UniProtKB/Swiss-Prot annotation, chain A:
Changing residue 48 to A: Complete loss of proteolytic activity. The active site is at 48 (for 3c-like proteinase), 148 (for 3c-like proteinase). Changing residue 69 to A: No effect on proteolytic activity. This is 3C-like proteinase. The chain holds residues 1387 to 1700 of 5088 of the full protein. Homodimer. Cysteine protease responsible for the majority of cleavages of the polyprotein. Recognizes substrates containing the core sequence [NT]-[EHKQSY]-|-[AGNST].
Amino acid sequence: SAASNPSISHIVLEMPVAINPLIKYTTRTSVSSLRGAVVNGYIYIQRHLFEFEACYNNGKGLLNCKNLERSKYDIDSAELIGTLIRIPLHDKHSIPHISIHPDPLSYNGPVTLYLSRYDTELNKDVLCVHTGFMSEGHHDIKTVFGDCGGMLFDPKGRLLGLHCAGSDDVVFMDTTTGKSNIWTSHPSEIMITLNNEINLPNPAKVVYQHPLRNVCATLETLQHLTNKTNAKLPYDSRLLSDFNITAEQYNQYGYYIDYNNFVNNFNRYTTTTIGTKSFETCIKYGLMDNKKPDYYNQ
Amino acid sequence: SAASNPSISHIVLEMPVAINPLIKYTVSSLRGAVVNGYIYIQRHLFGSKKQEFEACYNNGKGLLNCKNLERSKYDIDSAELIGTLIRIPLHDKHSIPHISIHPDPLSYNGPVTLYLSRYDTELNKDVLCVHTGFMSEGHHDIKTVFGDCGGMLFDPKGRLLGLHCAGSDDVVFMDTTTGKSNIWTSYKLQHPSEIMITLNNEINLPNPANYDFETTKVVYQHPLRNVCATLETLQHLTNKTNAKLPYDSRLLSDFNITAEQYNQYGYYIDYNNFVNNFNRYTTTTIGTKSFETCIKYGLMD
């Protein structure tokens, strides 16, 4: 129901499907493919389209790629930037330019994923949009390997980066201490920025500190579960090890928590819904209470 | 995580924000919808009580008191009250691009988008905004406020289903085919309604004449659900080996699922086990998915 659908408002983007071309690397006996992203005069293609050095061959491997025409792209000027291959367009505005988020790995909140697909009903290549949530370069929009190169945007239409990789499951611990935490007892979807930033160690098993979460939404959720009257309660340092929430953030948002109550009821609280919202949904988007009239708020 | 995000693919629509203008009667406001040469404005812009509506609309004279309804854009003199919709021809046909129309909107069941104009105070301009959710026969789950009436609902291929028109904070549940209580009558979790009207004045409500002036509570037979998804979820909960079991007629009264549909999809259910674990099953997640999400979208396996 509407009680549990975050119903995030995303600004509608108008972009040609050509901004996200399917690129195919072929040999006599095999094919590999993913999408490129044409951003502000350059196309960006991730390394695993192509063992790599021999196939990429210092850019020479680009000549064996379909939908990577020399008339469109300055192949000779292709640059290997870490996990990204960046190639200039001959006409830098043949694809319209787009807004870029100024600090994408610091973004936390709702996102969209845009992907080119061929629609068999409409009989044409079309851009497809998908909604979800991201926390510092990690998101929850389901992908397959070919979807590498899909484009991720914030709700204002600013580009965050490109879908890059994922995993069937992650392991959890307090990575700031190397100690197991409450979560040690969830697939990953990962983004790369146009400057080759990935929020993973040695990116050239995935370890998360906690499930995807928004700090304010988590505090709201935990307060609801453990302290319904929101009576003042001291900060618990396990908020730091279990949720990476600092004492400063705790005081800032004003949601007070009885954290022992959360620990002592951890299984029930993480397997039963709040209303009809899953715990994992609540800590991303908040409790989605029915909006009060604008004049009643202060 | 991605394990619980349905991640539905929606085709990106290229429409100008002018397709969904905010109309202000001065002050009350809602969105108009510009569809294939006409703008459609829900009448209750002028009031949600019949006598108040007639006096304010004044056989169209009230259109003169509306902001963002300039005479240069719309043929106000040719405005027609078409049921609960006011329809006005645009002076410039094809100034706003035409859109595809779903041939049978109230039969649609599955993912949807809601498109709404918003004024962005950062960008200092009007922008078109998209929202994702799910619909079952003219009832959907995208959270709205009253001013959002006139939002435009599309299927995943970009076919117009209709306009957002009404809703409520909660519904009551009954077997609306018999007047008897069913298992959801006992349900105590809040279930808001969000409701659509087609451009041809079709709405999925009982006694739909003057629905917009009605004060009645909204009555549902069951939560929003897709038949196949519901059967898949119930089989997972009650019968993990999927051993053959006969149809339970309570599926019809509790979920409006027929014996034919049950036979068709091949998901066998121990319905007694669902009944006996009703509260548990409707408050416990499957993996990390809520029950209400599972019966809309399936188990995503």
